[PDB]
Subunit: 495 residues, 3 copies
Amino acid sequence: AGDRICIGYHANNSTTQVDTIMEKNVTVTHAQDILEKEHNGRLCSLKGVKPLILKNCSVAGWLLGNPMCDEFLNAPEWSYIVEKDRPSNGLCYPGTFNYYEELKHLMSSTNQFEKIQIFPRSSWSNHDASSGVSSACPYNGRSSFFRNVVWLIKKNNVYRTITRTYNNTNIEDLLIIWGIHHPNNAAEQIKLYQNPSTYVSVGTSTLNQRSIPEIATRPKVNGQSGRMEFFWTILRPNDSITFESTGNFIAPEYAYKIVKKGDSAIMKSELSYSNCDTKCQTPVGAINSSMPFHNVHPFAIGECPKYVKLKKLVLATGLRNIPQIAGFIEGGWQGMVDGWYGYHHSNEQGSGYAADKESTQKAVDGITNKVNSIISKMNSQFEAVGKEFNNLERRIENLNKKMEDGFIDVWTYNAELLVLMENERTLDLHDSNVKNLYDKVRRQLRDNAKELGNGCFEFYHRCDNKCMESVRNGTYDYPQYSEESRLKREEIDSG
Amino acid sequence: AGDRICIGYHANNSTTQVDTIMEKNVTVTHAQDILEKEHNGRLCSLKGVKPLILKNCSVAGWLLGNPMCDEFLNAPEWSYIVEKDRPSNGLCYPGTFNYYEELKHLMSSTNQFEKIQIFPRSSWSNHDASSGVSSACPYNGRSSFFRNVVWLIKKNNVYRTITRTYNNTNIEDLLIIWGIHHPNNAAEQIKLYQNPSTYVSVGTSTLNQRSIPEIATRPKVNGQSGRMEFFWTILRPNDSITFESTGNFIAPEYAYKIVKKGDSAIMKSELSYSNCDTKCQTPVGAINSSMPFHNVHPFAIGECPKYVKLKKLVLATGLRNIPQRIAGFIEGGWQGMVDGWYGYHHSNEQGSGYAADKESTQKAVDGITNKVNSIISKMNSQFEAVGKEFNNLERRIENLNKKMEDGFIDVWTYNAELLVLMENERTLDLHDSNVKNLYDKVRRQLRDNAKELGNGCFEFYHRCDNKCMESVRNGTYDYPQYSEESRLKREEIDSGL
Amino acid sequence: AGDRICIGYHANNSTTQVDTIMEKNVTVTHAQDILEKEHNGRLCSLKGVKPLILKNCSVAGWLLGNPMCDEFLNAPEWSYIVEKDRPSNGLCYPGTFNYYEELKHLMSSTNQFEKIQIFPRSSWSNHDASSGVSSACPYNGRSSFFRNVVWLIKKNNVYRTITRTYNNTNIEDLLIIWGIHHPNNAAEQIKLYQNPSTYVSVGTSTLNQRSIPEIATRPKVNGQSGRMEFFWTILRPNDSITFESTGNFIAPEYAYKIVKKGDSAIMKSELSYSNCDTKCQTPVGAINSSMPFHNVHPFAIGECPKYVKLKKLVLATGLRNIPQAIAGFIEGGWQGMVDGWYGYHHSNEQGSGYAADKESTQKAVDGITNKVNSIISKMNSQFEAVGKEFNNLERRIENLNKKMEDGFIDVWTYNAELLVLMENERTLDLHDSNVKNLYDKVRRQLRDNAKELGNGCFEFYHRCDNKCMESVRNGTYDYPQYSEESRLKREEIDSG
Ligand SMILES: *[C@@H]1O[C@H](CO)[C@@H](O[C@@H]2O[C@H](CO)[C@@H](O)[C@H](O)[C@H]2NC(C)=O)[C@H](O)[C@H]1NC(C)=O
Ligand SMILES: *[C@@H]1O[C@H](CO)[C@@H](O)[C@H](O)[C@H]1NC(C)=O
Ligand SMILES: *[C@@H]1O[C@H](CO)[C@@H](O)[C@H](O)[C@H]1NC(C)=O
Ligand SMILES: *[C@@H]1O[C@H](CO)[C@@H](O)[C@H](O)[C@H]1NC(C)=O
Ligand SMILES: *[C@@H]1O[C@H](CO)[C@@H](O)[C@H](O)[C@H]1NC(C)=O
Ligand SMILES: *[C@@H]1O[C@H](CO)[C@@H](O)[C@H](O)[C@H]1NC(C)=O
Ligand SMILES: *[C@@H]1O[C@H](CO)[C@@H](O)[C@H](O)[C@H]1NC(C)=O
Ligand SMILES: *[C@@H]1O[C@H](CO)[C@@H](O)[C@H](O)[C@H]1NC(C)=O
Ligand SMILES: *[C@@H]1O[C@H](CO)[C@@H](O)[C@H](O)[C@H]1NC(C)=O
Ligand SMILES: *[C@@H]1O[C@H](CO)[C@@H](O)[C@H](O)[C@H]1NC(C)=O
Ligand SMILES: *[C@@H]1O[C@H](CO)[C@@H](O)[C@H](O)[C@H]1NC(C)=O
Ligand SMILES: *[C@@H]1O[C@H](CO)[C@@H](O)[C@H](O)[C@H]1NC(C)=O
Ligand SMILES: *[C@@H]1O[C@H](CO)[C@@H](O)[C@H](O)[C@H]1NC(C)=O
């Protein structure tokens, strides 16, 4: 009829929820979100270094010096490059650009260009380096031409065969770009370069190529029915390059020196620049976040969290919050805040709550050991930077898309399952911890007290604030109340 | 004995077996196999849409119209394309087909061609459109030729320059195929085309080309020593194509309108179609899609289960089956229980009793079927592999493709296997917990009113008929009611009775 | 007050430490490291078959017969090809080898060449097969040239058109290599081959190609400003190849028969063969492949363990070591107990002594050594990387291939780390459960005839001696037969 002690556990006001492999929407005591899902809608600069936003200039446009990309004629250093989905200013004069995508992929490994001149327009004596302009490349008004290459026209009805060498004495790699003109007619050829059969031969310690003009009738594009095929090579230091040509040569006036290699990318965003700083950016926005995961977009540059195709990823830190003298068989105690598991005693003197400090900090330490482990354990999740492919590279494009989405699916599965399988185990680690300290108080006071069936013990010898601490301490001396209790339960047996 | 209650669990004779991570081959009561292992050996329609059967024809054969191959004159829609692995009827006149494999890949995202005329054979008045036939492409026995292109010959010992344009007035894309002829020797060039230096030249909005013949002396394939190189493009709508040739031109007569882009495939299979239909086609037969997994072939088309390199995959859904060849759950299952996974065996008088904790039984069943659904949910969005062809100088990217597909098939085969193995051990781990929770539920109520035997039953320190039974099942047991009765019970045997 | 039976479990001297998901450095009685971490720094034969050591030669130099490179006249088979990272003898005459990477791939699935003659060097009755030499291909001072091709030159200011056929009347596939010569100017063209307009054409069933020489003026490399481009095809059996050329032709003298196709590889190492043998080799050395996993280097060939980028990976097998008036499992483990994992202790009238529960201890050894093999087993199929090479202009697929080699490595490191951690947890929690379930075997037998002392021991109310102890150990305590004696003494203890 008195002097008791109950085993119980923390409950509270929370209603955050987690999931388990078996049961879903389980309400828990505490729970951490590990998935960031919010991004500012702005293109920011990575680690203090601003991107190169090309507005609607294509990279081809940029590198060739399209007459409408004059903004980026001398572009500074860049963290990343943002091209729009379909840039408007590219090859204004129709034609193609060989190994284009392979060139853009090299850019992702470079951070700064120093454009230097090798063949000054002034050096084209014995040819016409002035009239080579067209209405396909208007400046302001009409008819200009790419700024970084020159279109050589016959002069005084002679196109003397050209031979010109340049020597990278620099210590940095050089990017050189040249082209060849594909005219409409047998007549347009003679009119432009006099000689009917021509060729453009370029030479490197690496690169041996001859090009001959494929001459044909075509639909006009941006006004023109002819086309220019463009070529590029990387000339290493101490290496030299030799051009020889009898016509249709589009020669380079400039080259780009690769002054800073390193991490970079080309992102496909129609957004534009804002004045912020970020450690991780995305086609749709930047991310301030210490979360281990995010779900805003597969592509992301910089030191940043790690993308998952999921809508929620919350981890269970505390108890199933099932709030309800009573004991743990009927629910959790709201009246205890000291810890996760603890006791309630009654006695002659008065009642009170007390946490099992030993078990709860071990819980805390063992739960923190898991969450910190999991988050910053497997850091090698498949992060990426995308790439482009041309109209006859479809199979390897798919190969790439197939693989990229392949690892996306694998890692999200890994994340989802770990969260669900660990939510299941912490939730019944808690369950177990409250059972074990129930057993530690019953193996202490043995037949000195009566199992009630609610999680509570009535005593046969009545003990207070020192023996209550003594049962809480794992210190309770059974032989001291041995024969005191024996007399009461021997009295209880008769009446 | 005087009045007992027992707690025990369902058993039956079901020799279904499951594996777990720790132990193998454990006989359960209930188990859901989830791995389809069978196929029907036929090639079928895909939910009503028939596959395009090329029989003995290669894709190149069909498109160029090799006389041994037939035309799909109704212009059907297909669900997939079946080609023999080594098709007899391809480029009957020897040559090659540039970016053949890229084109074949395009086909896999297309479901319906309609063939149209762009250059009628009756429109080459300036040249010979009839004599360009050959013994390597027979028909009636007579020497014939590809039906979709035209071998133009010098007319009257003259080969006037050819300029023709075609404008895609349609809203559909157009696949156009033309070629060039490579003769044996300088004399053949003159004999067929007069002009001894020639080119074939095409101009679209984004394609630019001027190709010239390569004279070599070659072994006789199919009886000819000259060759034919073929090219294809896609002429986008509102665009135009212009051909310039001064000899050796193999002119397109037709063109194919892509009128359905969709999900399609090129299966390489030797079988032939019969009247069946399926949700899921593989090269060696069709399989049912009732189950989430199959091990029949990694290339399957349609609403398919997910493929895993495994021989068995059985999900434990019930209990262990340890029956007794009386006592409760410490010696194993009762087959006396019909409805209910966890029940009682109340004994009062010399007959019997077998109930079922209906409640904790329908809490296990409502989570085992729940979590099962959740397992099959978690994989679906797995890796599915895709057919793709390569040639003899793309052996690297071919190997990359194959390593990556075997790669992900291995990952998920491991993922699925280890996921069920764990769910099997934890599904049975929950029955042991569930039965031990049934025992303790009664125990917390009865206290010193009943005696524990290490058996799973409680002999009663008083009398309990049917109503007292249902009371302890429903958790509504009045210890302070029989307490007094039970105490005098208990004192008799402690003294000597 | 006496006569005891205590439930306990094993301890020992172990320093060893495993990890779980929520515990780090946990000391266990027994464990098993499963990650190979060292190598011998030698390069070895692969189970009795030696690698092809190219020394300082590229695959090109070896195949074409660069003079500094040696013939493998013995036609040996090989396990794997070893080539340095920047070999020093390649295309001594500067030039290009088309689809070179494609060729090496074929090599990496090829295990034995036999070299055969197809166009004997003496056979060019109307051309110069001897002046074709260069200062860029020095063999012992004087000028020389690739030993397996022949640089055919005009005889007496004449280059009669060339047309030669070879029929493959072997059963194997043949590799045939040929090439073409791009001169510096139009002058040297006529100086070597006279005929100014020229070509080199190759016919097979599956090969049509006529190259024409690209004359430009290039930088000098190993002395030369001309260049030679090389080609290769694979001529199927019963097929013919016929070459037509009016100049600049570099005719093969020899062909290679692929006589053994199979598993091979091209390793990039700088070591040298060491008169040793292994089951698994890596560019840095051979590894002792008897663990299931290693972290030595990603590219490893042969019957190899599965590679993971961990620094440590060790399974749990025995109990958690917590040793230290005898008490049961609640105070920890018994260093006294040796013959098993779980078991009992008696403290009766004859003395004290430990006994193991073999029946339960074995079902635990049975399983745990089972689950071990089952972890080596479901990594039977993991992911092993294969060497592939690419040129600049294939830098996109090169990255694609390395993003995905790295991707699978990372996935499988995750799984291996995560599987060991999680079953370490379940191994220990298993031991927990057995020790508990052992206690209850005794607690449900003895029933009202013993009291539970709350530390894993029982005090019998009756006398027990040796064979009733053996009785409860054996799962057959005759409780009908001592309740009498116990019923007496509980009444004795409840008052007196
Ligand atoms: C490989 O090439 C080198 C240089 O072309 C050869 O010469 C020796 O190379 C080593 C490098 O391992 C140098 O340190 C020595 O000084 C060189 N000479 C001598 C006499 O040792 C080397 O012989 C070639 N072969 C091999 C198998 O390395
Ligand atoms: C819950 O209780 C806390 C006080 O401990 C209070 O600050 C908070 O606003 C309450 N509301 C919710 C939604 O948790
Ligand atoms: C689970 O929780 C979410 C959030 O409240 C809710 O939308 C959903 O209906 C819940 N349960 C089920 C079975 O969908
Ligand atoms: C190109 O960018 C400019 C920048 O002001 C923008 O005004 C324009 O809308 C873009 N082009 C087109 C065709 O919309
Ligand atoms: C290029 O410069 C290097 C020295 O920097 C020199 O060795 C080489 O001869 C030069 N080449 C030419 C064509 O001037
Ligand atoms: C497991 O038992 C099945 C009986 O269904 C038998 O076919 C199989 O061989 C056994 N496998 C093992 C590994 O014991
Ligand atoms: C699919 O199920 C039907 C009955 O629903 C069965 O007759 C048929 O054999 C099954 N298909 C296969 C491939 O086993
Ligand atoms: C396809 O070729 C095989 C091989 O000769 C032949 O048996 C079969 O009849 C051919 N099919 C048709 C429709 O010609
Ligand atoms: C197609 O028609 C003619 C070709 O004769 C051409 O002049 C015209 O501009 C084209 N128009 C289109 C493609 O809309
Ligand atoms: C094609 O051209 C017509 C008229 O020039 C135009 O109305 C139509 O939208 C265009 N469609 C495409 C797909 O180019
Ligand atoms: C585990 O052992 C290593 C060995 O000294 C030590 O560095 C580490 O701190 C230990 N434990 C933890 C919890 O990190
Ligand atoms: C290889 O194995 C043997 C025997 O297991 C051992 O003695 C030796 O030290 C090992 N060496 C290396 C380098 O792994
Ligand atoms: C090589 O084969 C050709 C054609 O395949 C044949 O005519 C001849 O028998 C063979 N040549 C020689 C020289 O045997």
